Structure 1
Amino acid sequence: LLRCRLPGGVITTKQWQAIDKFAGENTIYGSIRLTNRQTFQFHGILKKNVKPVHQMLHSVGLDALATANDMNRNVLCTSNPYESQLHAEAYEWAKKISEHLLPRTEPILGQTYLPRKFKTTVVIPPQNDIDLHANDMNFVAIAENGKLVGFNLLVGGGLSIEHGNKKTYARTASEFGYLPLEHTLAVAEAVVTTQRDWGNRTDRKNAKTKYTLERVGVETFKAEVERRAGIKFEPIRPYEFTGRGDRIGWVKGIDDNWHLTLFIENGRILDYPARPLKTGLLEIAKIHKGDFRITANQNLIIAGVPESEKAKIEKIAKESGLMNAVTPQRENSMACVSFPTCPLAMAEAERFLPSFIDNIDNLMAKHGVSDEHIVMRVTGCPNGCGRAMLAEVGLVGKAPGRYNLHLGGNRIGTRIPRMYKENITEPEILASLDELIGRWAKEREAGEGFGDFTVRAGIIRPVLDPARDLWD
Structure 2
Amino acid sequence: LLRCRLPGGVITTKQWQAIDKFAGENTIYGSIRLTNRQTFQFHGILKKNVKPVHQMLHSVGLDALATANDMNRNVLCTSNPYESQLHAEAYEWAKKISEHLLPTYLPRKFKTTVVIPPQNDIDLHANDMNFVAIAENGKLVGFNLLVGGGLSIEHGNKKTYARTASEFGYLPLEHTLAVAEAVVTTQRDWGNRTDRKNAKTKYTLERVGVETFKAEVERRAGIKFEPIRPYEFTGRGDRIGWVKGIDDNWHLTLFIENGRILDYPARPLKTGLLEIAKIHKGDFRITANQNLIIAGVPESEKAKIEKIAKESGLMNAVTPQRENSMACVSFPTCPLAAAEAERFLPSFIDNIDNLMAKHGVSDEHIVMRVTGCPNGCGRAMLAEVGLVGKAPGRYNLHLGGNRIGTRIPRMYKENITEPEILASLDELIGRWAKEREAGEGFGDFTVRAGIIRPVLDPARDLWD
Q: Same fold (TM over 0.5)?
A: yes
Decide whether the 8 Å contact of 1:5 with 1:67 is kept in 2.
no
**Could you say if the C-alpha distance between residues 67 and 121 of structure 1 is closer, same or farther in structure 2, counting changes exceeding 3 Å?**
farther
Report if the CA contact (8 A) 2:284-2:295 is conserved: yes
Query: Do the aligned partners of residues 69 and 372 (structure 1) sit closer, same or farther apart at CA in structure 2, a change above 3 Å counting?
Result: farther
- 3-state secondary structure, aligned to 1:458: coil
Q: Secondary structure at the match of 2:289?
A: coil
Q: 1:73/1:158 Cα in 2 relative to 1: closer, same or farther (>3 Å)?
A: same
Structure 1 residues 48-67: aligned runs within 5 Å: 48-66=48-66
- CA deviation map 1:322-368 (0-9, x unaligned): 00000000000000000000000000000000000000000000000
- The answer to whether the aligner puts 1:431 opposite 2:453 as a matched pair is no
> How far apart, in 1, do the equivalents of 2:291 and 2:2 lie?
19
Distance (Å, rounded) in 2 between the aligned partners of 1:67 and 1:197 = 20
**Inter-CA distance 329–420: structure 2 relative to 1 (3 Å threshold):** same
- The worse-fitting range, judged by mean Cα deviation, of 68-77 and 396-405 is 68-77
**Alpha-carbon distance, 1:66 to partner:** 4.3
Using the alignment, how far apart are the partners of 1:208 and 1:229 within structure 2? 21
> Greater shift after overlay, 221-230 or 1-10?
1-10
Deviations 1:207-235 (A, max 9, x none): 00000000000010001000000110011
Q: Deviations over 1:83-127 (max 9, x none)?
A: 000000000000000000110xxxxxxxxx000000000000000
For residues 69 and 297 of structure 1, what CA distance do their matches in structure 2 show? 27
CA-CA distance at 1:3 after TM superposition: 2.7
* Structure 2 CA distance for aligned equivalents of residues 258 and 66 of structure 1: 36
- For residues 205-284 of structure 1, the aligned pairs below 5 Å read 205-284=197-276
SS of the aligned residue for 1:211 comes to helix
Query: Does residue 1:97 correspond to 2:97, yes or no?
Result: yes
Say what the alpha-carbon RMSD is for the aligned residues. 0.7
8 Å CA contact 1:67, 1:74 repeated in 2: no
Within-5 A mapping of 1:264-413: 264-413=256-405
TM-superposed deviation, 1:48: 1.0
SS of the residue corresponding to residue 422 of structure 1 reads strand
* CA distance 1:66–1:25, change in 2 (3 Å): same
1:66 touches 1:73 (CA, 8 Å); kept in 2? Answer: no
Deviations 1:113-151 (A, max 9, x none): 000000000000000000000000000000011100000
Aligned residues: 463
* 1:385-410 C-alpha deviation (Å, 9 max, x unpaired): 00000000000000000000000000
SS class of match (1:394): strand
- CA gap of 1:200–1:467, structure 2 versus 1, over 3 A, is same
Q: Determine if contact 1:394/1:417 at 8 Å carries over to the other structure.
A: yes
The 3-state SS of whatever aligns with 2:57 is helix
The answer to whether the Cα contact below 8 Å between 1:162 and 1:382 also exists between their aligned partners in 2 is yes
User: How far, CA to CA, are the matches of 1:5 and 1:66 in structure 2?
Assistant: 10
The offset of 1:2, in angstroms, is: 2.6
For 1:339 and 1:413, locate their aligned partners in 2 and report how far apart those are by CA, in whole Å: 26
* Structure 1: gaps (5+ residues): 104-112
| 2:5 match: secondary structure | coil
| TM-score normalised by structure 1 residue count | 0.97
Q: Is 1:470 the equivalent of 2:462?
A: yes
CA contact (8 A) 1:7 1:98 kept: yes
Is residue 70–residue 116 contact of structure 1 (8 Å, CA) maintained in 2? no
Counterpart-to-counterpart distance in 2, 1:65 and 1:2: 8
CA distance in 2, matches of 1:8, 1:69: 22
Shift of 1:65: 1.6
Moved more, 126-135 or 57-66: 57-66
- Structure 2 counterpart SS, 1:70: coil
Secondary structure of the structure 1 residue equivalent to 2:63: coil
The Cα of 1:80 is off from its aligned counterpart by 0.1
Contact in 2 for aligned 1:390/1:415 (Cα 8 Å): yes
How far apart are residue 69 of structure 1 and its match?
5.5
What is the alpha-carbon distance in structure 2 between the residues aligned to residue 221 and residue 302 of structure 1?
Answer: 41
Q: Name the CA distance, whole Å, in 1 between partners of 2:453 and 2:177.
A: 39
- The question of whether the paired residues in 2 share the 8 Å contact of 1:159 and 1:169 is answered with yes
DSSP-derived class of the 1:177 partner:
strand
Where 2:84 maps in the other structure, the secondary structure is coil
Equivalent residue, structure 2, for 1:457:
449
| Contact in 2 for aligned 1:379/1:395 (Cα 8 Å) | yes
CA distance in 2, matches of 1:2, 1:159: 21
Q: Distance in 2 between matches of 1:66 and 1:229?
A: 27
Q: Is the 8 A contact 2:2 2:65 kept in 1?
A: no
8 A Cα contact 1:7 1:94, kept in partner: yes
* Distance of 1:350 and 1:318 partners within structure 2: 24
User: Residues 4 and 67 of structure 1 are in contact (CA less than 8 Å); yes or no, is this contact kept in structure 2?
Assistant: no
Give the corresponding residue for 1:183: 175
Provide structure 2 residue ranges, at least 5 long, that are not aligned to the other structure.
none
Q: Distance in 1 between matches of 2:291 and 2:256?
A: 5
Label 1:67 to 1:305 Cα distance change in 2 as closer, same or farther (>3 A): farther
Contact 2:160-2:197 within 8 A present in 1 as well: yes
Task: For residue 140 of structure 1, give the secondary structure of its aligned residue in structure 2.
Answer: strand
What TM-score, normalized by structure 2, do the two folds share?
A: 0.99
* Deviation >3 Å, runs of 4+: 66-70
CA distance in structure 2 between the partners assigned to 1:322 and 1:66 by the alignment: 33
SS at 1:2's partner residue?
coil
* 1:59-98: CA deviation from partner (whole Å, max 9, x where unpaired): 1000002467551100000000000000000000000000
- Return 164-173 or 70-79, whichever deviates more: 70-79
C-alpha distance in structure 1 between counterparts of 2:67 and 2:269, whole Å: 26
Shift of 1:272: 0.3
Asked if structure 2 preserves the Cα contact closer than 8 Å seen for 1:2 and 1:43, the reply is no
Distance in 2 (alpha carbons) for counterparts of 1:251 and 1:6: 23
Structure 1 residue matching 2:356: 3-state secondary structure? helix
Asked if the contact 1:260–1:301 (Cα under 8 Å) also holds between the matched residues in 2, the reply is yes
Partner SS state of residue 159, structure 1: coil
Contact 1:388 1:394 (8 Å CA) reproduced: yes
Distance in 1 (CA, whole Å) between partners of 2:436 and 2:69 is 44
Give, in whole Å, the separation in 1 of the partners of 2:137 and 2:365. Answer: 34
Structure 1 residue aligned with 2:8: 8
Distance 1:134 1:68, change over 3 A: farther
2:78 paired residue number:
78
